Ligand binder design. Sequence first.
Ligand SMILES: Nc1ncnc2c1ncn2[C@@H]1O[C@H](COP(=O)(O)OP(=O)(O)OP(=O)(O)O)[C@@H](O)[C@H]1O
Ligand SMILES: Nc1ncnc2c1ncn2[C@@H]1O[C@H](COP(=O)(O)OP(=O)(O)O)[C@@H](O)[C@H]1O
Ligand SMILES: Nc1ncnc2c1ncn2[C@@H]1O[C@H](COP(=O)(O)OP(=O)(O)O)[C@@H](O)[C@H]1O
Ligand SMILES: [Mg+2]
Lengths: 547, 487, 158
Amino acid sequence: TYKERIKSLKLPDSVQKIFDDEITKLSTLETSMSEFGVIRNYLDWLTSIPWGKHSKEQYSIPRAKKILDEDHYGMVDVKDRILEFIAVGKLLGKVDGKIICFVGPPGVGKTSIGKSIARALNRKFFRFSVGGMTDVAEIKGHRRTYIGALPGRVVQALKKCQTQNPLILIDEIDKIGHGGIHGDPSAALLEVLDPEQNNSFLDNYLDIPIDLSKVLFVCTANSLETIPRPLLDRMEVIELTGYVAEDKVKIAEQYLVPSAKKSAGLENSHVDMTEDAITALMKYYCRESGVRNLKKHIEKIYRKAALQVVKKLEKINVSISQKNLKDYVGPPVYTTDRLYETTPPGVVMGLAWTNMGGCSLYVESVLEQPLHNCKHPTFERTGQLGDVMKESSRLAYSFAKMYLAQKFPENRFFEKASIHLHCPEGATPKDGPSAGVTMATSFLSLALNKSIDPTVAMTGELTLTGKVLRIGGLREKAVAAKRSGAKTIIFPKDNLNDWEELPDNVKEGLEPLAADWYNDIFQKLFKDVNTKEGNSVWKAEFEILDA
Amino acid sequence: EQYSIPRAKKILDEDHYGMVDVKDRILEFIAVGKLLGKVDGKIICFVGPPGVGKTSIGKSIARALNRKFFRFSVGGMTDVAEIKGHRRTYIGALPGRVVQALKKCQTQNPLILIDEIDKIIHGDPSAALLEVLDPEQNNSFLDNYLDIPIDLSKVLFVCTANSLETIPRPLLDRMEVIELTGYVAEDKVKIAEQYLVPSAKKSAGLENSHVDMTEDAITALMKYYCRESGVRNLKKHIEKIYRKAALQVVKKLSKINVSISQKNLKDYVGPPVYTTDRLYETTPPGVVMGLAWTNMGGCSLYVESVLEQPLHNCKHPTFERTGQLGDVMKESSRLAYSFAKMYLAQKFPENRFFEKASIHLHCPEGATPKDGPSAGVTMATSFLSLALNKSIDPTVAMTGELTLTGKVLRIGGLREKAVAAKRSGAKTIIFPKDNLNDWEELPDNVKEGLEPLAADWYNDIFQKLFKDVNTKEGNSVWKAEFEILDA
Amino acid sequence: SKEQYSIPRAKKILDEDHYGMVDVKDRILEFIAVGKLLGKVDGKIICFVGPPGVGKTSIGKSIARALNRKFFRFSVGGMTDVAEIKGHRRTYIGALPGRVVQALKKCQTQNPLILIDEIDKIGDPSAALLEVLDPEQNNSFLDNYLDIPIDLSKVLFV
Ligand SMILES: Nc1ncnc2c1ncn2[C@@H]1O[C@H](COP(=O)(O)OP(=O)(O)OP(=O)(O)O)[C@@H](O)[C@H]1O
Ligand SMILES: Nc1ncnc2c1ncn2[C@@H]1O[C@H](COP(=O)(O)OP(=O)(O)O)[C@@H](O)[C@H]1O
Ligand SMILES: Nc1ncnc2c1ncn2[C@@H]1O[C@H](COP(=O)(O)OP(=O)(O)O)[C@@H](O)[C@H]1O
Ligand SMILES: [Mg+2]
């Protein structure tokens, strides 16, 4: 019936023999039975895979570069990786197989670059979602001639591409279900992504195994820690980070504005957004580390502009700027210095990195009591701290007590201080030891009645001896510090190399300070303390009542 | 077909009444499609509580574009085989919704309404609706059933959802959500009198000008019997009343015109069942109102801080919490404890209330689960109210998140909170200044009768509420209470 | 061939069957009144909600007596799939009439009453139930063994 495609597809020997046996067995089969329908459905599912149809690789380095940079602006690591792949493929007859994953917060653009890479490599694209996955039924497939059986999604993807060596982009790997009964997709993904096992995939629906060696498995994920170690072992990862304010403005003006303009179908040279409007929107209306909220705001504004311009068929051109910004989106939402421009004693700024990217959290230590009544020294902490951060809080408790009792002998604050520790935004879960120093500076500040120069943000892990250890992720923290108005950033010395690899735009406007021990932080912040001014601070509060 | 803004606006205004914002969004869509030679079948999704009518906009937009309306239920499909189609060679195969729709459209650019997105063996409907609703993969159907190639970009999928949590993120990021909110009392009364009363009257086989509902009667009906923002319960009640009226007129076999007033208000179908605005006018010290948001809508929870015993014969200051507070609300309660304890010392040094007081904190209706930091300032006001022995002007509502330093932070949802405050008889609402933007997006009908108070720090709230508490009487309130236990 | 419109006789018929079930009697009274105000009883299919054992199976026969139409009891739980049981080709040796065929030949009366035995005690038969109960599809059901069109929308179920 459809032997022409079989002849033209250039099948390997064994699979061709299998298909010829199947067709010559079906030739003598009577069409009346439903078994004929089942077997022809199997042949439809079988002949769909292009066993020998593959596209032609692209050899032009400048063409690949010009395709890549026309679609995205600042993500350079992926471009370099693609250029290395292109050069390696050109240097040999044909190279394929490597699997790459992208890790970053939402809005970076790791999903959008899939099509750009597919066009740059002159190959087709497919998108694969594993977010709601909880079983292996849709990965490896089922038995052949079940009435309700559906084959695996990988062979379906191959059919949709209808050409070998495609580009299959897995949407999520960190959102894979744990897996109870009916299947555990992690093992199926392990089998699929093994570089050497790809030659013998051995799908359940088709007993003949398909060659996945030429297939390019691109990957997208948010958090690296959720992925199990077996999966991460066989896959290479590239960290796609956030964008600076100037980089966000460049990305917006270059790509987001024309994309929203053409989505609403507005003629050029009629409606445009000025630079001040975009920078004001991003700075005073949004806080996310990507450009997604900016994109939705731009699309909504351009839809409103389209509605305005259609209804008229003083000016035929619409200009969007500061003076008419609060007519398209409304009053502003957030504020850069959102808590307070100044800082009372006991409050310390700090940085954090969550699934949504970099952010700034404050740490507030207060006396849950009058000036000094207490009659019992107690330490209380609230907020969604988590186990690691609660342990960091206790360690900071002990370290601050020892540090005062060493540096300032007769400062007896912790003898009868009932301290309450809170991290604002109490509905947002927090974790990680990166605030270990941040809390240590808080209590000390609360115990010295001194501010911490609100233009200063700090991070790092603290130990009982005062040593400051490495932290997992600095560039996002630095971007968050720059966004929130901090000019001085305190990071552990171990991250100094991580500070050197930062782009010149991230480092600009931020004053580095690599602290090995906590003494460096104390000297940087508590300067005017003369060992007698910061000593006997609560002399009146102890003599009059506490005796 | 053709995109004419005025006639579409008139059609939408005739079909629905209080959907000003949704009508504006639909007009935006029509204007966007006008400048293009063909609408590219962009997918529009509606998110709102059931009962607001989001299944009715389908007909209005279909006839505004002069197109047929199609309906599709996802809650009954689990397998993808019923979507891709079945060949006619099979004896047992039956046409699915996709095949039947493709047969009976008979015209390009159809419109299909999805029953629900919150309603998800040998089949995963999530993947099926993913490939249906994926704009990039939508164009790759290429079925061999039709010799001529066909394009799936002609379908304007319309979604339906109550809570955005159920929608997965991979679906959410490629889907545009249009939010539909509830209707205030007046809006729901107009919607009823204009669409539900005539439709239910005709359904019960009753021509108009036979039985009528007075304004007071219908308002009492939608107040004491209807609480949720939708009109499902209102429609059911109207249908039941008109069925009873039809039975009565059959029994009479006929005067004919009977009026439903408030003096004899629905005594044949029972008395009021839901009532909230009769608790108590005068609010005692330590009790304060606050607003909460749930999927049902807005509500008014009280917060009562009391002494377990009179202060003159109590010791060992303890803090107790009841109600289904949860972790975040308990942490907010502890924060309010600390903030009030520090605030009295800062303002009234000689008031030693918290030194020897055992406080008990409750939220009435202790069976309903609660959560969220939106009551952070609500609790902190109670303790001071209990400490200063001062009432809190019972005609005020309060919400906001509090920190240790004493700042009010942004809260998650002010429209339903404002509606609940208005429904509860409050004439003043205290909300964070960061939420002022939301206060400027509320319909103008909500804002009358409520005096806004945007506060950054708690000092604003304290000055607004505690005006007649000077530093001479504020720090000397118990006094004689501490003249007994200190000897 | 004609419907009964006398409410009092239906009330008296329902009275002797059960002692103090007044809400269901009243509801069927408004149902009959609504049908009286219209040309034909259509728009809703009567369905009862309650714990088992209160007698929601003799109600079908009671309503049949009140409406004075023949009663037929149909078991949906005997269905396995939505494809194999919904009829057979006429040209095949395996032709077999559907359940509607024997229901109609037993009733021999327009608008016969059909009672579903168990739905909450049973691909999936939900699709078949939707196809046979939704009035939008009952106008042109066209059973495989029934060449003549059958309008199931006029047919009332319990
Ligand atoms: N450098 C850039 N140049 C052009 N467009 C960009 C750039 N960075 C981001 N974008 C755009 O911003 C939007 C957000 O990207 P996208 O949603 O693909 O990424 P993501 O949020 O990391 O992914 P996901 O939603 O799958 O987790 C896209 O429209 C993308 O094209
Ligand atoms: N303005 C209105 N005019 C007419 N009918 C309305 C209006 N608002 C709501 N309704 C009715 O309320 C019902 C709400 O149903 P809906 O909640 O959309 O269903 P679902 O929960 O499946 O989304 C609709 O059937 C509609 O008939
Ligand atoms: N007034 C009554 N007193 C006692 N039993 C009754 C009464 N009315 C009905 N029943 C019983 O209820 C039984 C059926 O109840 P129900 O559970 O609703 O139906 P089914 O058993 O078919 O689900 C009948 O067998 C009948 O004997
Ligand atoms: Mg991601």
